Subunit: 259 residues, 3 copies
Amino acid sequence: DYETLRIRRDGYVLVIGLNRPAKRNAFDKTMLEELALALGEYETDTDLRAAVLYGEGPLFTAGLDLASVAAEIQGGASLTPEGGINPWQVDGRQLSKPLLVAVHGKVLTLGIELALAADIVIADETATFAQLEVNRGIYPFGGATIRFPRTAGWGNAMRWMLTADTFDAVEAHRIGIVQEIVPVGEHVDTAIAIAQTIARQAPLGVQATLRNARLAVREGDAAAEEQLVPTVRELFTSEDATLGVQAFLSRTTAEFVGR
Amino acid sequence: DYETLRIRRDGYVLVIGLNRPAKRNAFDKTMLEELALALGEYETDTDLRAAVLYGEGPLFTAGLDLASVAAEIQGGASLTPEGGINPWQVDGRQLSKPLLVAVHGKVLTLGIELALAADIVIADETATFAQLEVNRGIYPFGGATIRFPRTAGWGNAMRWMLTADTFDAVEAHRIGIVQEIVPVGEHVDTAIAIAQTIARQAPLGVQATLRNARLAVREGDAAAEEQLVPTVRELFTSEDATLGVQAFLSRTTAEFVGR
Amino acid sequence: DYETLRIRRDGYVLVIGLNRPAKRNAFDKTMLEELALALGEYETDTDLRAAVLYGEGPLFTAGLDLASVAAEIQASLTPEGGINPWQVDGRQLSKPLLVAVHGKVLTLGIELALAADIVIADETATFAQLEVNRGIYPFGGATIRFPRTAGWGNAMRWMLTADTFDAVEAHRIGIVQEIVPVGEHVDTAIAIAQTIARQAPLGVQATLRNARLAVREGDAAAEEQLVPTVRELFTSEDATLGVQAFLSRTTAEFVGR
């Protein structure tokens, strides 16, 4: 199957490992396209309720392998095959289901932007971060300009985006990019445990949470507000709502089916 | 007056305690409507300058009383009575004057959303929080999908909303939901002290701060910007602007009248 | 000297001090107009890559000198070639602004810090949004930027009360990026400004422009520009000098084109 990704399944959870460790997981054309496919596959697989993305080897990613895609970015060509989804989710399409990102070592450029594109980010204590693009004559073009100021606040984001200075896990956690810092090497297992918790919850409710939250950002408060009660009405209609409410009333544990 | 609310007036500050002791202050139709009315009544009472909301007994609230309400949400009915305002303020109307929420013990589902709907949140050291809606087959439909990501950042919000995991006052404060943590039992008194500070300020100035801030969120930066100077010009016209000027010159505390 | 400002150039970095210490650096009509002109000049001077704004003497600013402007507000205070330093009239700086604060930062001072891109405080800095305490409200952008940066609750705790908060709280809630020992705020801001000035200027400008577009027009608007903008940058001399430095292990001297 995939040349540059290591893929496994742990029940309802997909675990995707960037797997070009000899090249520090730099995104070449192949890994760009494979990650797009893997995430597109994730999107349409109804057996999957959460996905965890991490990197094999010494660090999460060294960023873009420019030569590999010279070429495409110069011509404005897409590195999203049919039926992939841009992993950075900045072309008008986002994932309908949760993505968690587990980071360690250097997280450069596009790596920061991958973490910002996800829903939950876990770092081990070694993680460092650097938005190096302006140091190289360009700028962040994977969504940092949009998402970093929204998560960290404008000032905290610009301190790092304008300078290209390196910042560590403690700082990334302080300013909201990283949700939790764990001991060396535990980032992937911590992210899967959280993914499994997500997978024990009602999938259509999880999906509705992501959907309404995204609508608020894209169309505004009124647009999200207008959907709140109609969406809960539709969910009260699902098998899982009756399962979940009966479990609550019975002080028992619900086994959701995703309909 | 109210069956499920305990209401007191401390000068310019309204103090409202949730009070359904046999059901852990969970919101059924009755308490929903009564809170809606009490807040609509606060809105129109020009002798009131701030409102504090807390929970009687061992917790703030256990959230939504599944049904009671379930049946009536299935069928589309509005639980906001004539004269009332949706306390969660997600139907296109918001309070014109400040709301502070004082929490302690368990703050479940709608309780987190009440805190998010308010202007200032004070927790005692015992407060814990859980966005349990996805654990019950539904999702958060009281505004957490809009407000939690905006306050905490997307990742911090999704860590709790997608998992239904419990988090403590320390986390709640770290991520911006709780403004101050105080010792056990001191939440309501601290919230009232802050409300009384607000009630000492110029009521039209306080209202203008809220109004322009909401405009920015609802219509965008340009819409808010456009009103900045016309609004301050209208305030210079007030009795309170001249009272505030005289206090500035005399280095004394103004007794504002709200016009 | 202007009269109300002390201005100097430190290489690519413009350093502006508010200079009315006998009046607690209150903004009167003159300093409002001088700061507007200096920032307008910063904007069109292609030899400046960053600007640092601080206060001379004991504090950053005591706020507005109302008497000085009362007639005007009750008329624009931006002169020709000027830009509103608070950047709430539909126009913002294209290049970075850092604000270095110490001592009291009252009313419009909080809002200058909020209009900036990076804020450094020394340990003595305290903040008070006093406007509601005086019969009016914050009208220099705090109502927009304070809730966005700090979160609604953290912002309203201070905006609705007029209570004083300190550097540690301003840092906790996102307004201040770093707290430094007493008197080191300007030096630190300048050091960061110099780091900015070593990066590619059209990259720095693109970062600001696209981030502002996201705020003013929305995610789709900003997203649509991402690749067209990087494409244009790849055409620049500085992109070539950047690639030459990476592949040859050297440090680039960018030229801003």
